[PDB]
Amino acid sequence: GPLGSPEFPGRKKEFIMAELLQTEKAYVRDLHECLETYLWEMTSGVEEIPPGILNKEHIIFGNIQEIYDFHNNIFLKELEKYEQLPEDVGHCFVTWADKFQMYVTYCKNKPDSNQLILEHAGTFFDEIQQRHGLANSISSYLIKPVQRVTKYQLLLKELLTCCEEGKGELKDGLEVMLSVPKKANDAMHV
């Protein structure tokens, strides 16, 4: 029934490579619709933004603006070239490993982001929601990055343990993924 114990690595030749190909497009699109909605209206000063979050756009959504642009013109269109080869995406987490330091910044601002959307952001995003047909709460999008970095660990652990031919780069692609949220805790100072 609605369980997942008989193991279910997705449906198609490229099972879980499709799970990564799809989360690019899901991630660059879900970043797109974020800048255009919640970030747009706070930077365009067209609604009354509570005195706590107005110049705290960079807290509410952190540095998400830099994520869209860089993925839609790089990570996505670099990944679709690996559609025929999930053996080469270990080379892709590493190709940009140092750029993953941006994820250590993102997470350090995450909790204080939370605080501001709870107490002093208020209900303001609920009205914008309905105007554009957002359907989903604000909190959902801004936390998604951390849901996404778990997914990277999910699929990458799959490849590096099951690739009959694991040419290389895979475990390094892993260690970079793991050192980021680890760093954020150690380097706690935001």
- For residues 159 and 170, the answer to whether their CB atoms sit within 8 Å is yes
Burial class for 151, CB neighbours closer than 10 Å (0-12, 13-18, 19+): middle
What experiment produced this structure? NMR
The CATH number given to whatever domain includes residue 60 is: 1.20.900.10
Say how many C-beta atoms besides its own lie within 10 A of residue 110's C-beta. 17
- Total number of domains constituting the chain: 1
Return the half-sphere exposure (C-beta side, CA atoms, 13 A cut-off) of residue 22: 11
Residues in the chain: 190
> What is the per-residue burial (b if ≥16 Cβ within 10 Å, else e) of 39-64?
bebbeeeeeebeebbeebbebbbbeb
| Domain containing residue 172 | 1-190
Say how many C-beta atoms besides its own lie within 10 A of residue 185's C-beta. 10
SS3 per-residue string spanning the chain: CCCCCCCCCCCCCCCCHHHHHHHHHHHHHHHHHHHHHHHHHHHCCCCCCCCCCCCCHHHHCCCCHHHHHHHHHHHHHHHHHHCCCHHHCHHHHHHCCHHHHHHHHHHHCHHHHHHHHHHHHCCHHHHHHHHHCCCCCHHHHHHHHHHHHHHHHHHHHHHHHHCCCCCCCHHHHHHHHHHHHHHHHHCCCC
